[PDB]
Coordinates of C-alpha atoms in Angstrom, one line a residue:
Chain A
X1 CA 110.4 110.8 118.8
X2 CA 109.7 107.2 118.9
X3 CA 111.4 104.1 120.0
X4 CA 112.0 101.5 117.3
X5 CA 113.7 98.0 117.2
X6 CA 116.5 98.8 115.1
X7 CA 119.3 97.4 112.9
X8 CA 123.2 98.5 112.7
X9 CA 123.3 99.7 108.7
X10 CA 124.6 96.8 107.1
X11 CA 126.7 97.7 104.4
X12 CA 129.8 97.3 105.7
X13 CA 128.9 93.5 106.2
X14 CA 127.3 93.4 102.4
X15 CA 130.2 93.8 100.9
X16 CA 132.1 91.0 102.8
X17 CA 129.0 88.4 101.3
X18 CA 129.9 85.9 98.8
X19 CA 128.5 82.6 97.4
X20 CA 130.4 79.6 97.9
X21 CA 129.4 76.1 96.3
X22 CA 130.4 72.6 96.4
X23 CA 128.8 70.4 93.9
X24 CA 125.0 70.5 94.6
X25 CA 125.2 72.3 98.1
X26 CA 125.3 76.3 97.5
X27 CA 125.2 78.7 100.8
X28 CA 126.6 82.1 101.8
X29 CA 130.1 82.7 103.2
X30 CA 131.8 86.2 104.6
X31 CA 135.1 87.5 102.6
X32 CA 137.7 89.1 104.9
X33 CA 141.1 89.9 103.5
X34 CA 142.1 86.9 101.8
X35 CA 139.8 84.4 103.5
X36 CA 136.5 83.4 102.9
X37 CA 134.6 82.2 106.3
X38 CA 131.3 79.9 105.8
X39 CA 129.9 76.7 107.6
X40 CA 131.6 73.1 107.5
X41 CA 128.7 71.6 106.5
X42 CA 129.0 73.1 102.6
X43 CA 131.4 69.5 101.7
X44 CA 128.1 67.5 101.5
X45 CA 123.8 62.6 108.8
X46 CA 126.8 62.2 111.0
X47 CA 129.3 62.8 108.3
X48 CA 132.5 62.7 109.2
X49 CA 133.2 66.3 107.9
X50 CA 137.1 65.6 108.6
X51 CA 137.1 62.9 106.1
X52 CA 134.8 63.9 103.6
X53 CA 137.5 67.1 103.6
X54 CA 140.1 64.9 101.8
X55 CA 137.9 63.5 98.9
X56 CA 137.7 67.4 98.5
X57 CA 140.3 69.7 96.8
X58 CA 140.6 73.4 96.1
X59 CA 139.0 73.5 92.7
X60 CA 136.2 71.6 94.4
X61 CA 135.1 75.0 96.0
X62 CA 133.5 77.4 93.8
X63 CA 133.6 80.9 95.4
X64 CA 131.5 83.6 93.4
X65 CA 131.4 87.6 94.8
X66 CA 129.5 89.6 92.6
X67 CA 130.0 88.3 88.9
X68 CA 133.5 86.9 89.8
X69 CA 134.6 83.7 90.3
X70 CA 137.0 83.9 93.3
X71 CA 140.3 81.4 93.0
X72 CA 140.6 79.3 95.9
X73 CA 144.1 78.4 96.3
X74 CA 144.0 77.4 100.3
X75 CA 141.1 75.4 102.3
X76 CA 140.9 74.3 106.0
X77 CA 138.7 74.1 108.7
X78 CA 138.3 75.6 112.6
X79 CA 135.9 73.9 114.7
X80 CA 132.6 74.0 112.4
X81 CA 133.5 76.6 110.0
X82 CA 135.6 76.2 106.6
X83 CA 138.1 78.8 106.0
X84 CA 139.1 79.1 102.1
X85 CA 142.2 81.1 100.7
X86 CA 141.3 83.5 97.8
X87 CA 143.7 84.6 95.5
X88 CA 142.4 88.3 96.1
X89 CA 141.8 89.9 99.2
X90 CA 138.5 91.8 99.5
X91 CA 138.8 95.3 98.6
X92 CA 135.4 96.0 101.0
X93 CA 136.9 94.5 104.2
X94 CA 136.0 96.7 107.2
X95 CA 138.0 97.1 109.9
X96 CA 136.4 94.2 112.2
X97 CA 137.0 91.5 115.1
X98 CA 135.4 88.2 116.0
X99 CA 133.3 88.3 119.5
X100 CA 131.6 85.8 121.1
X101 CA 128.5 87.2 122.6
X102 CA 126.8 86.3 125.6
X103 CA 123.2 84.7 126.2
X104 CA 120.7 88.3 126.1
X105 CA 122.8 90.2 123.7
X106 CA 121.8 91.3 120.7
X107 CA 123.1 91.9 117.3
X108 CA 121.8 92.5 114.0
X109 CA 121.6 89.7 111.2
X110 CA 122.0 89.9 107.4
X111 CA 120.1 87.3 105.6
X112 CA 121.5 86.4 102.5
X113 CA 120.8 83.8 100.0
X114 CA 123.6 83.0 96.9
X115 CA 125.7 85.0 98.3
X116 CA 123.0 88.1 97.9
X117 CA 121.7 90.2 100.9
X118 CA 118.3 89.9 100.6
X119 CA 117.3 91.8 104.5
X120 CA 118.6 93.1 107.8
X121 CA 116.8 92.4 111.1
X122 CA 117.5 92.8 114.8
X123 CA 117.3 89.9 117.0
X124 CA 118.7 88.4 120.3
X125 CA 120.8 85.7 121.7
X126 CA 118.0 83.8 123.8
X127 CA 118.6 82.1 127.4
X128 CA 118.3 79.1 125.8
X129 CA 121.2 79.6 123.1
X130 CA 119.0 79.9 119.9
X131 CA 117.9 83.0 118.2
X132 CA 114.2 83.6 116.8
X133 CA 115.1 84.2 113.0
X134 CA 113.8 84.4 109.9
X135 CA 115.5 82.2 108.0
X136 CA 114.7 80.0 104.5
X137 CA 116.7 77.2 102.9
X138 CA 120.0 78.6 101.2
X139 CA 120.6 81.2 104.1
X140 CA 123.6 79.4 106.3
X141 CA 126.4 81.4 106.2
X142 CA 124.3 84.6 106.8
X143 CA 125.7 86.4 109.7
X144 CA 125.1 88.5 112.7
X145 CA 127.3 91.2 113.9
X146 CA 127.1 94.7 116.0
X147 CA 129.2 98.0 114.9
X148 CA 131.1 99.4 117.6
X149 CA 132.6 103.0 116.0
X150 CA 133.8 101.8 112.8
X151 CA 135.0 98.0 114.0
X152 CA 132.6 95.1 113.0
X153 CA 132.0 92.6 115.2
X154 CA 131.0 89.7 114.1
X155 CA 129.5 87.4 116.4
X156 CA 127.1 84.9 114.3
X157 CA 127.1 82.4 111.8
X158 CA 124.1 80.9 110.8
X159 CA 123.8 77.1 110.4
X160 CA 120.6 75.6 111.1
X161 CA 117.0 75.4 112.0
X162 CA 115.8 73.5 115.1
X163 CA 112.4 71.7 115.2
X164 CA 110.6 74.5 117.0
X165 CA 111.3 76.5 114.0
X166 CA 114.5 78.4 116.0
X167 CA 118.0 78.9 114.8
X168 CA 121.3 77.9 115.8
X169 CA 125.1 78.7 115.0
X170 CA 128.5 79.4 115.8
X171 CA 130.8 82.5 116.4
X172 CA 133.3 83.1 113.8
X173 CA 135.8 80.9 115.4
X174 CA 133.1 78.0 114.2
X175 CA 132.3 77.2 117.8
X176 CA 128.4 76.4 118.5
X177 CA 126.1 78.6 120.7
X178 CA 124.6 76.0 123.2
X179 CA 124.8 72.6 122.9
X180 CA 124.0 71.7 119.7
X181 CA 126.1 70.1 116.3
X182 CA 125.6 70.7 112.8
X183 CA 124.5 67.4 111.9
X184 CA 121.0 65.3 112.1
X185 CA 119.9 64.2 115.2
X186 CA 116.9 65.0 117.8
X187 CA 118.1 67.8 119.3
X188 CA 115.8 70.5 120.3
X189 CA 115.6 74.0 121.8
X190 CA 115.8 73.9 125.6
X191 CA 112.4 75.8 127.4
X192 CA 112.8 79.6 126.8
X193 CA 112.8 82.5 129.5
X194 CA 112.4 86.2 129.3
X195 CA 115.3 88.2 129.5
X196 CA 114.6 90.4 132.5
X197 CA 117.8 92.7 132.1
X198 CA 116.8 93.7 128.8
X199 CA 113.0 94.3 130.0
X200 CA 114.3 96.6 132.8
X201 CA 116.6 98.3 130.1
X202 CA 113.4 98.9 127.9
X203 CA 111.6 100.4 130.8
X204 CA 114.5 102.8 130.9
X205 CA 113.6 103.8 127.5
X206 CA 110.1 104.3 128.1
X207 CA 110.8 106.8 131.1
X208 CA 113.7 108.6 128.8
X209 CA 110.9 108.8 125.8
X210 CA 108.5 110.2 128.7
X211 CA 106.6 107.1 129.2
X212 CA 106.5 106.9 132.9
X213 CA 102.9 106.3 134.4
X214 CA 104.2 102.9 135.7
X215 CA 106.7 104.2 138.3
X216 CA 105.8 104.0 141.5
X217 CA 107.5 105.3 145.2
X218 CA 108.4 101.8 146.3
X219 CA 111.6 99.4 146.2
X220 CA 112.0 96.0 146.6
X221 CA 115.2 93.8 147.6
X222 CA 116.5 91.8 144.8
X223 CA 115.7 88.5 146.0
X224 CA 111.8 89.3 146.4
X225 CA 112.2 90.4 143.0
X226 CA 113.2 87.4 141.4
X227 CA 110.8 85.5 143.9
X228 CA 108.0 87.4 141.8
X229 CA 109.9 87.4 138.4
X230 CA 110.6 83.8 138.0
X231 CA 107.3 82.7 138.5
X232 CA 106.4 84.9 135.1
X233 CA 109.1 82.9 133.6
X234 CA 111.6 85.9 133.5
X235 CA 115.4 85.0 134.2
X236 CA 116.5 85.5 137.7
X237 CA 118.2 88.9 137.8
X238 CA 121.3 89.2 139.3
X239 CA 124.0 91.8 140.7
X240 CA 126.1 92.0 137.8
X241 CA 123.0 92.9 136.1
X242 CA 121.8 95.8 138.3
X243 CA 125.1 96.9 137.5
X244 CA 125.0 96.5 134.0
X245 CA 121.8 98.9 134.4
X246 CA 123.8 101.5 136.3
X247 CA 124.5 104.4 133.4
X248 CA 120.9 103.8 133.0
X249 CA 119.9 104.4 136.5
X250 CA 122.0 107.5 136.8
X251 CA 120.8 108.9 133.6
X252 CA 117.1 108.8 135.0
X253 CA 118.0 109.1 138.6
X254 CA 116.2 105.9 139.3
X255 CA 117.3 102.9 140.9
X256 CA 117.5 99.5 139.6
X257 CA 115.5 98.1 142.4
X258 CA 113.3 100.9 142.0
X259 CA 112.4 100.2 138.4
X260 CA 112.3 96.5 139.7
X261 CA 109.6 97.3 141.7
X262 CA 107.9 98.7 139.1
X263 CA 108.3 96.0 136.5
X264 CA 106.9 93.9 139.4
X265 CA 103.6 95.7 139.7
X266 CA 103.9 95.1 135.9
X267 CA 103.7 91.4 135.8
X268 CA 101.2 91.3 138.8
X269 CA 98.4 93.7 138.0
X270 CA 99.1 94.0 133.8
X271 CA 98.8 97.4 132.1
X272 CA 95.5 97.8 132.6
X273 CA 94.7 98.3 128.6
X274 CA 97.7 100.6 128.9
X275 CA 100.6 101.0 126.4
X276 CA 104.5 101.5 127.3
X277 CA 106.5 102.9 123.9
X278 CA 103.1 102.2 122.3
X279 CA 103.5 98.2 123.0
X280 CA 101.0 96.5 125.3
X281 CA 103.7 94.1 126.1
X282 CA 107.1 93.8 127.8
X283 CA 109.8 94.2 125.0
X284 CA 112.9 91.7 126.0
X285 CA 115.2 92.4 122.9
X286 CA 116.9 95.8 123.5
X287 CA 120.1 95.5 125.9
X288 CA 121.2 98.3 127.9
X289 CA 123.4 99.4 125.3
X290 CA 120.7 99.3 122.7
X291 CA 119.3 102.1 124.7
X292 CA 121.8 104.2 125.2
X293 CA 122.6 104.2 121.6
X294 CA 119.4 104.9 120.1
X295 CA 118.1 107.4 122.9
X296 CA 121.5 109.0 122.3
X297 CA 122.1 109.3 118.5
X298 CA 125.1 107.6 118.1
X299 CA 126.3 107.1 114.7
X300 CA 128.9 105.4 112.8
Chain B
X1 CA 111.1 79.6 109.4
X2 CA 110.5 82.6 111.7
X3 CA 109.0 85.9 110.9
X4 CA 110.4 89.1 111.6
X5 CA 110.1 92.9 111.0
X6 CA 112.9 93.5 108.4
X7 CA 114.8 95.9 106.5
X8 CA 116.2 95.7 103.0
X9 CA 120.4 96.0 103.3
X10 CA 120.8 99.8 103.6
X11 CA 124.4 100.0 102.0
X12 CA 123.1 101.0 98.8
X13 CA 122.0 104.1 100.7
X14 CA 124.6 104.8 103.0
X15 CA 127.1 105.1 100.2
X16 CA 124.8 108.5 99.3
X17 CA 124.3 110.3 102.6
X18 CA 126.1 113.6 103.2
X19 CA 126.1 116.3 105.9
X20 CA 124.4 119.7 104.5
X21 CA 125.0 122.9 106.7
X22 CA 123.9 126.5 106.4
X23 CA 124.9 128.8 109.4
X24 CA 124.3 127.1 112.6
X25 CA 121.7 124.4 110.5
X26 CA 123.0 120.9 110.2
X27 CA 120.7 118.0 108.6
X28 CA 121.2 115.1 106.2
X29 CA 121.2 115.0 102.3
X30 CA 121.0 112.6 99.7
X31 CA 124.2 112.5 96.8
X32 CA 123.1 110.8 93.6
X33 CA 125.5 111.4 90.6
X34 CA 126.1 115.2 90.7
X35 CA 123.3 116.1 92.9
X36 CA 122.3 116.7 96.6
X37 CA 118.8 116.9 97.8
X38 CA 117.5 117.6 101.2
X39 CA 114.9 119.3 103.4
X40 CA 114.8 123.4 102.3
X41 CA 114.4 124.4 105.6
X42 CA 118.1 123.8 106.2
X43 CA 118.4 127.3 104.9
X44 CA 115.7 129.4 107.5
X45 CA 116.5 129.9 110.8
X46 CA 114.6 129.4 114.1
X47 CA 112.6 132.2 113.7
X48 CA 111.6 131.9 109.9
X49 CA 109.7 128.8 111.0
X50 CA 107.1 130.5 112.3
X51 CA 105.9 131.1 108.4
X52 CA 109.3 131.5 106.4
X53 CA 108.7 132.6 102.9
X54 CA 111.4 129.8 101.2
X55 CA 111.6 131.8 97.8
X56 CA 112.3 135.0 99.6
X57 CA 114.8 133.2 101.9
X58 CA 116.5 131.1 98.8
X59 CA 117.1 134.0 96.8
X60 CA 119.2 135.4 99.3
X61 CA 121.8 132.6 99.7
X62 CA 124.4 131.9 97.1
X63 CA 126.0 128.9 96.3
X64 CA 129.3 129.1 98.7
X65 CA 126.3 129.1 101.5
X66 CA 126.2 125.6 101.7
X67 CA 128.8 123.5 103.3
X68 CA 128.4 120.1 102.0
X69 CA 130.6 117.3 103.2
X70 CA 131.1 113.7 102.6
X71 CA 133.0 112.6 105.5
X72 CA 134.8 115.2 106.6
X73 CA 135.6 116.1 102.6
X74 CA 133.9 119.5 101.4
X75 CA 131.8 118.9 98.3
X76 CA 131.5 122.2 96.1
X77 CA 128.0 123.0 95.2
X78 CA 128.0 124.9 91.8
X79 CA 124.2 125.3 91.3
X80 CA 120.8 125.1 93.6
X81 CA 117.2 125.5 93.0
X82 CA 113.9 124.4 95.0
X83 CA 111.7 121.7 94.2
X84 CA 108.6 121.8 96.6
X85 CA 110.1 121.2 99.9
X86 CA 113.5 120.3 98.7
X87 CA 116.9 122.1 97.7
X88 CA 118.4 120.3 94.9
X89 CA 122.2 121.3 95.1
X90 CA 124.3 120.7 92.3
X91 CA 127.8 119.9 93.2
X92 CA 131.2 119.9 91.2
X93 CA 131.9 116.2 91.6
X94 CA 130.2 113.0 90.9
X95 CA 129.2 109.7 93.3
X96 CA 130.8 107.1 92.2
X97 CA 128.4 104.7 94.9
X98 CA 125.2 106.1 93.1
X99 CA 123.2 102.8 93.1
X100 CA 120.8 102.1 89.9
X101 CA 117.7 104.4 91.3
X102 CA 114.3 106.0 90.8
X103 CA 112.0 108.2 92.9
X104 CA 108.7 106.8 93.8
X105 CA 105.7 108.1 95.7
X106 CA 104.0 105.5 97.8
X107 CA 100.4 104.5 99.0
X108 CA 99.1 104.7 102.6
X109 CA 99.2 101.2 103.8
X110 CA 102.9 100.1 102.0
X111 CA 106.1 99.7 103.7
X112 CA 109.5 101.0 103.2
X113 CA 113.1 101.0 104.9
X114 CA 114.4 104.0 106.8
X115 CA 118.1 104.7 107.3
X116 CA 118.2 107.0 110.3
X117 CA 121.0 109.7 109.6
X118 CA 122.6 112.4 111.9
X119 CA 125.3 114.5 110.7
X120 CA 125.8 112.9 107.1
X121 CA 126.0 109.4 108.9
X122 CA 124.2 106.4 109.8
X123 CA 123.0 105.4 112.7
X124 CA 120.3 102.6 112.2
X125 CA 118.0 101.2 109.7
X126 CA 114.4 100.1 110.3
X127 CA 111.4 99.2 108.5
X128 CA 108.0 100.9 108.7
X129 CA 104.5 101.7 107.0
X130 CA 103.1 104.9 105.7
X131 CA 100.0 105.2 107.9
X132 CA 96.6 105.8 106.1
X133 CA 97.3 109.4 107.9
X134 CA 99.9 109.5 105.9
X135 CA 102.7 110.0 109.2
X136 CA 104.7 107.1 110.2
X137 CA 106.1 106.5 113.5
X138 CA 109.6 106.5 113.1
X139 CA 112.5 106.8 115.6
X140 CA 114.2 110.3 114.9
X141 CA 115.9 112.7 117.0
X142 CA 116.4 116.3 116.3
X143 CA 119.1 116.2 113.3
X144 CA 117.8 113.3 111.2
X145 CA 116.2 115.5 108.8
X146 CA 116.6 114.4 105.3
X147 CA 116.9 110.3 106.4
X148 CA 115.5 108.8 103.5
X149 CA 112.9 106.1 103.2
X150 CA 113.7 103.2 100.3
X151 CA 112.5 99.7 98.9
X152 CA 115.3 97.6 96.6
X153 CA 113.9 95.7 93.9
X154 CA 117.3 93.7 92.5
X155 CA 120.0 96.4 92.7
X156 CA 117.7 99.1 91.8
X157 CA 116.8 101.4 95.0
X158 CA 113.3 103.4 95.1
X159 CA 113.6 106.3 97.3
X160 CA 109.9 107.2 98.6
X161 CA 110.5 109.0 101.6
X162 CA 112.4 112.2 103.0
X163 CA 112.1 113.1 106.6
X164 CA 111.2 116.6 107.4
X165 CA 109.7 116.8 110.9
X166 CA 107.9 115.6 113.8
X167 CA 104.0 116.1 114.8
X168 CA 102.8 117.3 118.4
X169 CA 101.8 113.3 118.8
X170 CA 105.3 112.2 118.6
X171 CA 104.4 110.9 114.7
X172 CA 106.8 111.8 111.8
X173 CA 106.1 113.7 108.3
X174 CA 107.9 113.9 105.5
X175 CA 108.1 114.0 101.6
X176 CA 108.7 111.9 98.6
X177 CA 111.9 112.8 96.2
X178 CA 110.1 115.4 94.6
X179 CA 109.7 117.4 97.7
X180 CA 105.8 116.7 97.9
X181 CA 104.6 116.0 101.4
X182 CA 102.5 113.1 102.0
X183 CA 99.6 114.5 103.7
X184 CA 98.0 117.9 104.5
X185 CA 101.6 118.8 106.2
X186 CA 103.9 121.8 105.5
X187 CA 107.4 122.7 106.5
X188 CA 106.6 125.1 108.8
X189 CA 105.8 125.7 112.9
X190 CA 101.9 125.3 113.9
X191 CA 99.2 124.0 115.4
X192 CA 99.1 121.0 113.0
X193 CA 98.2 117.4 114.3
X194 CA 98.0 113.9 112.7
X195 CA 94.7 112.9 111.2
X196 CA 92.8 109.9 112.4
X197 CA 94.8 106.7 112.2
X198 CA 93.2 103.7 110.9
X199 CA 94.1 99.9 111.2
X200 CA 95.5 98.8 107.6
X201 CA 93.6 95.7 107.0
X202 CA 95.1 94.6 104.0
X203 CA 98.5 94.0 105.9
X204 CA 96.9 92.2 109.0
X205 CA 95.2 90.0 106.6
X206 CA 99.0 89.3 105.0
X207 CA 100.3 88.9 108.9
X208 CA 97.5 86.2 109.6
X209 CA 98.6 84.2 106.5
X210 CA 102.5 84.6 108.0
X211 CA 101.2 83.3 110.9
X212 CA 99.3 80.3 109.5
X213 CA 102.7 79.8 106.9
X214 CA 104.5 79.1 110.1
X215 CA 102.4 76.9 112.0
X216 CA 99.8 79.4 114.5
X217 CA 96.5 78.6 113.6
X218 CA 94.5 78.9 116.6
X219 CA 93.1 82.2 115.8
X220 CA 91.2 80.1 112.2
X221 CA 87.2 78.6 112.2
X222 CA 85.0 76.9 110.3
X223 CA 83.4 80.2 109.1
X224 CA 83.3 82.2 106.2
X225 CA 82.0 85.8 105.4
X226 CA 81.0 87.9 102.4
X227 CA 83.4 91.0 101.8
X228 CA 80.4 93.3 103.0
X229 CA 79.4 91.8 106.3
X230 CA 83.3 91.9 107.1
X231 CA 83.8 95.6 106.5
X232 CA 80.4 96.2 108.9
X233 CA 82.2 94.8 112.0
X234 CA 86.0 95.7 111.1
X235 CA 84.8 99.3 110.1
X236 CA 83.4 99.3 113.5
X237 CA 86.7 98.6 114.8
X238 CA 89.0 101.5 113.0
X239 CA 89.9 99.1 110.4
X240 CA 90.0 100.5 106.9
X241 CA 87.5 99.0 104.6
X242 CA 88.7 96.0 102.8
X243 CA 88.2 96.5 98.9
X244 CA 87.6 93.6 96.2
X245 CA 91.2 94.2 94.7
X246 CA 92.7 93.8 98.4
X247 CA 91.1 90.6 98.6
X248 CA 92.4 89.7 94.8
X249 CA 96.1 90.5 96.0
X250 CA 95.6 88.3 98.8
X251 CA 95.5 85.2 96.2
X252 CA 98.7 83.7 95.9
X253 CA 99.1 83.8 99.5
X254 CA 95.5 81.9 99.8
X255 CA 96.3 79.6 97.1
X256 CA 99.7 79.0 99.0
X257 CA 97.9 78.3 102.2
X258 CA 94.5 76.7 101.1
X259 CA 92.9 79.1 103.1
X260 CA 90.1 81.1 101.1
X261 CA 90.5 84.9 101.7
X262 CA 86.8 85.6 102.9
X263 CA 87.4 82.6 105.3
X264 CA 90.4 84.7 106.6
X265 CA 88.6 87.6 107.0
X266 CA 86.0 85.4 108.9
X267 CA 88.9 84.7 111.1
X268 CA 90.1 88.1 111.7
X269 CA 86.2 88.9 112.1
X270 CA 85.7 86.8 115.1
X271 CA 89.1 88.0 116.3
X272 CA 87.6 91.4 116.4
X273 CA 84.9 90.4 118.2
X274 CA 86.4 88.4 120.7
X275 CA 89.9 89.5 121.6
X276 CA 92.5 87.2 121.7
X277 CA 92.4 86.0 125.3
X278 CA 95.7 86.4 126.3
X279 CA 96.8 84.6 123.1
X280 CA 99.3 85.7 120.6
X281 CA 100.1 85.4 117.2
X282 CA 103.8 85.1 115.9
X283 CA 104.4 86.1 119.6
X284 CA 102.3 89.3 119.1
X285 CA 99.5 89.7 121.6
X286 CA 97.8 92.6 118.9
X287 CA 97.2 92.4 115.3
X288 CA 100.3 93.8 113.3
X289 CA 99.4 95.9 110.7
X290 CA 103.2 96.9 109.0
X291 CA 103.5 94.0 106.6
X292 CA 102.3 94.0 103.2
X293 CA 101.4 91.0 101.2
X294 CA 104.2 91.6 98.9
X295 CA 106.7 91.5 102.2
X296 CA 105.1 88.1 103.7
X297 CA 105.6 86.5 100.2
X298 CA 109.2 88.0 100.3
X299 CA 110.1 86.4 103.4
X300 CA 108.0 83.6 104.1
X301 CA 107.0 82.0 100.5

């Protein structure tokens, strides 16, 4: 049946995307009820946003939804975000919540340009607080989300590209992930590591799909595992991660440290020209929950 | 910057998914205007599949035999008929979320977005390619039949695939929206097997170009080759023969990066002969072939 890196259906987020233009600057905004969220830098090297906000009046902002202009009747700022009040509550607003995700967690990104959705892909918040996305100029304001039941949890809004070509942004409260700031400076991505917890979740998915050649009859202590894995640039695995893997461990009857012994053997010796879920490399962008959802057939 | 396997936004298709039930069998249906499309095997039981005769099976069914549901709300079917391996059910009400659309039969090597559904509801969206052997490496569990594959140009949706089954090796087969199977497969239980799978050369070349557009250019070399000499090597590694037409499709991408197509074929040739020596391209340690030149241009440009 295969295992696929997949994204959550994006319709519910597509219905909230609008084009926000302030002068020469056009980008995307997220329209929920009667508020439009967009990156603070639409009101434009080290600018005092707070100040440039004065020169601005509601009629300065042009918010477009489909072939219709949304009249702005209020403006404010919350951290690095802009909150525009419009005179029309979005009829497509889905049930939603704003969430701040932690390193290693994944989400779907709806790439947009001119308030119009262009594509959706799956990605992960990297250990160094960036995301390896795919954005072109004009994508600022695009958002990342997860879907739980029928509630849309927005966890990311796109702000900029770092010199190595990776991306940085904020939660929907306007607070950046990582020490990044929306301004020009010489900020760069810190060294990145492999998300061990996610590699382990993926090996469980393989076993669940019948790809179990790499299993062995040994085990290891947590520390011995970390001592080998860090040498390959893997994030240290903690007791809390081990706990997050409990449901998968129980479903397969394979203890986490027993899976860690298989992983350790995979790192030191390799795959011997073999494959796991058709892959020649250990995938690190599927979380324990992504595995449960895809292996089970969760719908929305 | 950045390059990702991406799908088209699924919202226009989501609003067309419904549930179709017959007896104990339930699968997905596509609701456009006043018609619901779904795999015809929703009508025959388990047994039947041993070689059911659908004409015989269909004529024994009535409009009320079909339980179509949009949400938990039932749609009354007032008509039905068969078209190749699909059922077309006429419902007494029209779908207001129906987007502008058309039915397209794609060629092997082309890509499309799949909206995996169960019980008529959206589970996930992913991007794939119709393989040279006409199967797709999808991610589907029992109950996903009827989910569709599509592309979007502007606001127009091009439906090109409807899922029907899984083959012995675990890959998938299906049909276009006229019910015509892609490949030598049949909706019946049998010893069927996927044909010989080859690597989509045109796409691997588009991908090396997307790698170049985003830095990564270690695999490049000072050599060039002839179309003919390229094929002699590539065809030795299970790669599809590259035609002059393919070379032409890569033109814009060639002009954009300033690397001639045959020069890029030279680079690939070298790659196939020497492996990547533990290196990676766009983060991959294998040459990826599920990105058409069109896909790369749209995303990189």
